[PDB]
Amino acid sequence: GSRKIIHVDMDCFAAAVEMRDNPALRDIPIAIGGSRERRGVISCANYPARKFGVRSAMPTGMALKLCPHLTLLPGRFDAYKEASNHIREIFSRYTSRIEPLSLDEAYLDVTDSVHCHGSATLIAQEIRQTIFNELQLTASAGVAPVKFLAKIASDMNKPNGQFVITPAEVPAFLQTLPLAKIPGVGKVSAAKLEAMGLRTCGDVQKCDLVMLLKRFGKFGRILWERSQGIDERDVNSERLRKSVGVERTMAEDIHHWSECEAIIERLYPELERRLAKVKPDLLIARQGVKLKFDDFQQTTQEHVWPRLNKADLIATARKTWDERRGGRGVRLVGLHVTLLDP
DNA sequence: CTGGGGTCCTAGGACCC
DNA sequence: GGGTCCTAGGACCC
Numbered sequence: 001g002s003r004k005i006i007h008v009d010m011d012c013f014a015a016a017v018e019m020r021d022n023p024a025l026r027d028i029p030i031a032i033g034g035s036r037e038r039r040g041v042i043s044c045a046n047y048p049a050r051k052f053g054v055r056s057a058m059p060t061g062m063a064l065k066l067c068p069h070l071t072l073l074p075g076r077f078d079a080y081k082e083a084s085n086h087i088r089e090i091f092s093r094y095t096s097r098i099e100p101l102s103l104d105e106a107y108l109d110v111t112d113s114v115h116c117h118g119s120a121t122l123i124a125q126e127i128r129q130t131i132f133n134e135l136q137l138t139a140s141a142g143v144a145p146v147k148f149l150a151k152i153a154s155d156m157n158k159p160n161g162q163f164v165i166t167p168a169e170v171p172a173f174l175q176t177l178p179l180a181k182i183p184g185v186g187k188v189s190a191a192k193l194e195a196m197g198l199r200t201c202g203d204v205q206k207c208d209l210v211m212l213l214k215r216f217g218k219f220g221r222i223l224w225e226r227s228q229g230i231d232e233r234d235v236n237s238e239r240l241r242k243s244v245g246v247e248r249t250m251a252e253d254i255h256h257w258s259e260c261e262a263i264i265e266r267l268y269p270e271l272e273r274r275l276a277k278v279k280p281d282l283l284i285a286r287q288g289v290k291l292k293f294d295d296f297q298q299t300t301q302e303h304v305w306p307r308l309n310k311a312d313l314i315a316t317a318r319k320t321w322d323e324r325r326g327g328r329g330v331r332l333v334g335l336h337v338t339l340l341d342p
Numbered sequence: 343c344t345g346g347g348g349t350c351c352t353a354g355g356a357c358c359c
Numbered sequence: 360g361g362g363t364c365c366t367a368g369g370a371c372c373c
């Protein structure tokens with residue numbers, strides 16, 4: 001049919017929760033990210049900091065080259081987690097059809113709700129307001145007939161605002177929309193479809209689908225469907241965690257197995273505790289390890305295995321350390337585990 | 343000067359048709 | 360010629 005979707009997105013989420021519990025940071029540049037001593041990167045940044053040009057996923061070295069007086073915080077999870085619990089409860093009051101994406105996001109299908117006389121625009125306005133009133137944080141909304149447009153619109157108005165796209169607005173909206181804003185079209189593909197001349201949807205709309213399944217396979221279909229603004233994906237509230245990882249990047253590389261083993265001794269207890277919260281008996285499907293060398297190439301060894309076992313990890317890492325390092329430094333060691341199927 | 347937590351997609355070989 | 364599991368890797372998102 002024609003549904004009503006509401007992408008809610010907390011505005012620079014982890015930064016906002018810091019500014020509220022510490023109003024001193026309200027107007028001075030702040031970021032959450034690992035310190036440059038540790039080779040970290042920026043998670044999020046307040047608006048005083050984005051002035052300078054600091055964005056998420058930026059190396060901390062560069063965040064300070066463009067904003068020296070940047071206050072760097074490590075980050076507090078629950079403070080973000082507890083806040084993200086509340087917003088989800090607030091969604092619960094309006095629908096049960098809630099697809100949580102990350103901590104600050106949520107797709108909401110409201111097609112079958114009469115909370116605000118069946119107007120998605122108010123329901124969105126309500127959640128944004130009632131989140132503000134009880135958590136003292138601001139949120140932003142995107143209303144659309146489908147999932148990906150509701151998300152694009154949530155960044156449309158950006159800070160403490162919303163943006164609505166009706167089916168009559170859609171065909172014009174997609175003429176000028178660049179492929180890179182379509183969630184799932186990141187840097188590499190954006191660069192590639194453009195080597196073929198395709199920068200906006202409207203360029204793809206005049207293209208052939210037979211060939212787009214040649215050059216891109218399945219991804220060419222998804223591209224083609226939304227360059228057409230078709231998106232059948234349903235708001236699923238049932239998705240579960242499939243895997244639990246713990247990984248670490250160290251200040252200066254390591255070159256000897258004894259060091260790598262010393263790291264594994266310390267990340268295993270965290271992986272145990274984390275997996276305990278979900279499987280108190282530790283039964284799993286596969287476990288494995290992950291190295292990242294200095295040439296940034298990354299390798300994985302993982303094999304079917306019944307229960308989180310410390311000694312098999314050290315074993316498997318050691319074997320990977322031997323036959324795949326080629327005597328390069330390694331900047332990252334990590335442990336992984338794939339959950340059982342239920 | 344490049345995190346840490348994840349998701350989904352691809353592809354070859356193995357296994358069992 | 361199948362499906363499906365197993366494994367490794369890559370693009371992508373917050």
Ligand SMILES: Nc1ccn([C@@H]2O[C@H](COP(=O)(O)CP(=O)(O)OP(=O)(O)O)[C@@H](O)[C@H]2O)c(=O)n1
Nearest residue numbers: 009010011012013014015043044056057104373
């Ligand atoms: N690469 C990344 C990107 C995001 N994050 C995490 O994602 C959160 C919100 O996502 P987000 O993408 O919405 C950013 P937000 O802070 O909310 O800015 P906005 O107001 O424009 O939406 C941040 O608070 C970070 O912890 C990360 O850890 N690594």
Ligand SMILES: [Mn+2]
Nearest residue numbers: 009010011012
């Ligand atoms: Mn956000």
Ligand SMILES: [Mn+2]
Nearest residue numbers: 009010104105
């Ligand atoms: Mn978000």
